[PDB]
Design a protein around this ligand. Structure first.
Ligand code: MG
Ligand code: MG
Ligand code: MG
Ligand code: MG
Ligand code: MG
Ligand code: MG
Lengths: 147, 147, 147, 149, 149, 149
């Protein structure tokens, strides 16, 4: 008998990012919004940075400023709030020192300590209900070593 | 380095439905069927109804009667069994009183107590093996406040 | 109000495979690869074989030898390592005896004891970094009863 | 050359009615509630349960055996009251009724097993306008239920 | 002005063979089994395990040290027998053998660690045609294993 | 005809600072570390935590109250040292400082609650070139933290 399963993977051998539990991060995520609290439940996940060189510092920024755009109207865009490892993420690059990442402290050689990843969004005129419908965008992730 | 993640969300600010854990319900679900027990493992999930007005009663029905239709033969349809919060769901509307939902009892203002959601299906001539192959359909969800 | 959810399922009433928790196996899986350890985190999952006849032995092999093929270059293929229930899986068929599967030992009639399922992959010249980019393939699953 | 692993196996058997977890696991004997200095509140403990009965036609009455309190474990005069909740109805010494039909016995699983229902135990300071004194506390939630006839 | 949190750290170290959980966590010292009045049965406890050994070439013998029973904790005459299972083989006082090759040592993880195997502890009434008396019970599963030479 | 389920409710209340789990659950009083004969090492216990404070402008100092050890519970002379870690900084008797800004107080949740941080307790043999003697051990991790002014 035959059951079929697609296997895909995403290699990169200088530096990558996976969840603490070793599985790959997903390729997409659905955020929720609450009528009662008028806000969006965020998305938390734990990640360990892998690398071939732990000695390097690590700088972070979004390839471009993240938004959830109405899929039937471009003019409607509620901004996306990104946060990694206690630090807010934007175009304005943030630097992450190796010793501040706790490399020894975890894992087999190279792997870092778990860092929190949060993604969320808020209405631009926060507190006034957003317009109904579906929304979408891409949070893109830029991180290099050596500043 | 660049890793890409799609962010989508689904706003609605009068009333919505999310899982108890605050994440959004999925957009699709795979049910299983068992050869040995000749039945289908159901799908359970916990949800909290959000709203801008807790005072309203809540009526529920499927936009239309739910089925799993063979994807290579429309003539083959095993019916879909839906159940929310101890009450079976159909076209025949079911009413859910606010005080019976336990609003105060949970959460920040407005949010309700967790309610179970079950989806399943059975062979129409239950007990005689269904024909092999893939099947599909949409469970659509109708809930309004004020009867 | 209307929220939409797709329900799909995959019937087969002589023999099927589902996870121990009763949910269906996914249709696809993303493996991860680690820069630091230069390896791929595997994918473990627990399954119970269902059947209409527990008395039969069970033979296993992949419909064809499993690979992760660069999606922009066919010439790049890192091999896929498959393992089920303590036994490595390949084209070379492996036989699984019913009494060795522990049928009584579990579940309502017919269902077997949980068996581990591992999928992974390794560089073909293991220890030398693989080339970056995305990769893909299908692990296909062949299991019949009666050898 | 003797390698042995011991595991203690216990069970609270009741043949008429019992409240288990949604997953079929037994409820905890004990639960620990954290408290937040930042938000000045306790994090409620929540768990999905299902009544299992031998008579699914019967009503279900549930009540606490005594008003539950967090008690300073070095000073019995210090208390914060415990709040309990089940299937959306706040519990008390004053009983609450749950009709067999509002329990969802049809909609779920085997005979005599209910739909799932949220059990919540939290606590609070006496006047939210003030914080509790530091230290350890403890208390007992004593759940009491008859089905009827 | 002193805020301290204490955590007790324990460990059962065996250098030759030990059975851990699939996730690497240590097995429980204790397990609680719920019982269902509706279905008149106990919910088995199940957990994925992996033998870790220092010799993966050796056979693995496993057995209970004494036939396990649930015992009424107010009346020792009252018992329901405990059923134990591992890697699909029912356990007993009578040993069972598990060949190094049927354990899946190659297929998984580091040297000396097995594929995953289901450990099941449940129990039952003495004659399914009757229910147990209400009350609390308890018992001990005492797992015994040699590898060999 | 009396069916009652008792649940013990406890709580460690501190109004100035407390470390809870990321999910809001209270940390464990106790943790069990398995050890692997195959890999000759212990499986570290790991859990995501968040400081909750009443002053998110303050620094956070954290230290152990005494150097933690696994102690043979039949022979006090036998020890394996315990290693503790939090938010990527190895803990000790020698204090460690954590600036309010390196904690991620903005990036997460309600006022006064930090971003998540990994707490790790593991242990090791004294000279990795040798194994520990078999038996049970136990010890105490005693976490100590001031915020400051
Ligand atoms: Mg639960
Ligand atoms: Mg009360
Ligand atoms: Mg497990
Ligand atoms: Mg036995
Ligand atoms: Mg946690
Ligand atoms: Mg230390």
């Amino acid at each position: 008998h035959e059951k079929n399963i697609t296997v895909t993977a995403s290699v990169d051998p200088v530096i990558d990012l996976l969840q603490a539990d070793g599985n790959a991060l997903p390729s997409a995520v659905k955020l929720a919004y609450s009528p009662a609290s008028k806000t969006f439940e965020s998305y938390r996940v734990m990640t360990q940075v892998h690398t071939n060189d732990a000695t390097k510092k690590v700088i972070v920024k979004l390839a471009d400023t993240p938004q959830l755009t109405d899929v039937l109207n471009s003019t409607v865009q509620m901004p996306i709030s990104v946060s990694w490892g206690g630090q807010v993420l934007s175009t304005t690059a943030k630097e992450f020192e190796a010793a501040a990442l706790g490399y020894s402290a975890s894992g087999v050689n190279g792997v870092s300590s778990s860092q929190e990843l949060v993604i969320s969004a808020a209405p631009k005129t926060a507190g006034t209900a957003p317009t109904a419908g579906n929304y979408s965008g891409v949070v893109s992730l830029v991180m290099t070593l050596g500043s």
